[PDB]
Amino acid sequence: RHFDVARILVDQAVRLGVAEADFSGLPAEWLAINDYGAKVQAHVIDTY
Amino acid sequence: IERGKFRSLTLVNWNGFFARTFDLDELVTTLSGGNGAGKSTTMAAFVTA
Amino acid sequence: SSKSVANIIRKTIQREQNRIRMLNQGLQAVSFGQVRGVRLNVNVRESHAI
Ligand SMILES: Nc1ncnc2c1ncn2[C@@H]1O[C@H](COP(=O)(O)OP(=O)(O)OP(=O)(O)O)[C@@H](O)[C@H]1O
């Protein structure tokens, strides 16, 4: 079920403000969010 | 052997994209978003490049 | 005859402009993507007004 959760969570998270680092020109890293090899690429959401 | 691969796609100062890099997958990359999200714009980026 | 023609065209254009402009208010700000409203623009063409 993990995937069907991740998507939904992201859908809920991106409506809440933006990430200021996205204008810095510095790409974000692919942080692992579990075992088995799942990864996420997103800057911290700062400006609400 | 060892087919070359497109690793990344960068958009700079475009409508909705000041500076955005997508890491192209080795097999499948899937853009997803509501109407007007700007996916056709990304494929436009790829082709025009 | 030419004057009468021009007059009848002007009257018909004015009537149709009024009808369409009244009709335009029959729309209520549809929400589609980044499109927030749809409207019909009717304007007499200067190239034809001359
Ligand atoms: N040449 C242009 N001039 C003005 N606005 C544009 C132009 N091209 C795209 N847009 C706007 O940019 C936004 C993204 O358009 P685009 O077609 O890339 O979206 P999309 O998410 O890929 O679309 P869809 O999923 O419906 O195929 C929309 O508001 C569109 O109106």
Ligand SMILES: [Mg+2]
């Ligand atoms: Mg599109």
